[PDB]
């Protein structure tokens, strides 16, 4: 995508891992290739430290979807709140 903000899992892409026809469907900054593989670096450090460059899918999380005990388990700039749910933006690029 557009930038090192940009999050996007690109194990699941239309057609296999790391494919694409375009350049959301590669993570980071990376963008698509002429041969439809995605290309380039994500982000430098990848992963990101917590903030806008911290990408973490929240579905797969212990005790269900968007729940916490800590913030690395949150996405992005995202904190676990007291109550044991993810909180606040995550800050990620749109595209």
Same mark, same amino acid.
């Given at each position: 995508?557009?930038?090192?903000?940009?999050?996007?899992?690109?194990?699941?892409?239309?057609?296999? !891992?790391?494919? =694409?026809?375009?350049?959301? +469907?590669? #993570?980071?900054?990376?963008? =698509? @290739?002429? @041969? /439809? $593989? =995605? +290309? /380039?670096?994500?982000?430098?450090?990848? !992963?990101? *430290?917590?903030? *806008? %460059?911290?990408?973490?899918?929240?579905?797969?999380? !212990?005790? /269900? *979807?968007?729940? =916490?005990?800590?913030?690395? +388990?949150? #996405?992005?700039?995202? %904190?676990?709140?007291?109550?044991? $749910?993810? +909180?606040? %933006?995550?800050?990620?690029?749109?595209?």
């Amino acid at each position: 995508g557009s930038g090192p903000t940009y999050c996007w899992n690109e194990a699941n892409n239309p057609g296999g !891992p790391n494919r =694409c026809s375009n350049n959301k +469907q590669c #993570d980071g900054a990376r963008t =698509c @290739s002429s @041969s /439809g $593989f =995605c +290309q /380039g670096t994500s982000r430098k450090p990848d !992963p990101g *430290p917590k903030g *806008p %460059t911290y990408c973490w899918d929240e579905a797969k999380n !212990p005790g /269900g *979807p968007n729940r =916490c005990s800590n913030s690395k +388990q949150c #996405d992005g700039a995202r %904190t676990c709140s007291s109550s044991g $749910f993810c +909180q606040g %933006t995550a800050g990620h690029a749109a595209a």
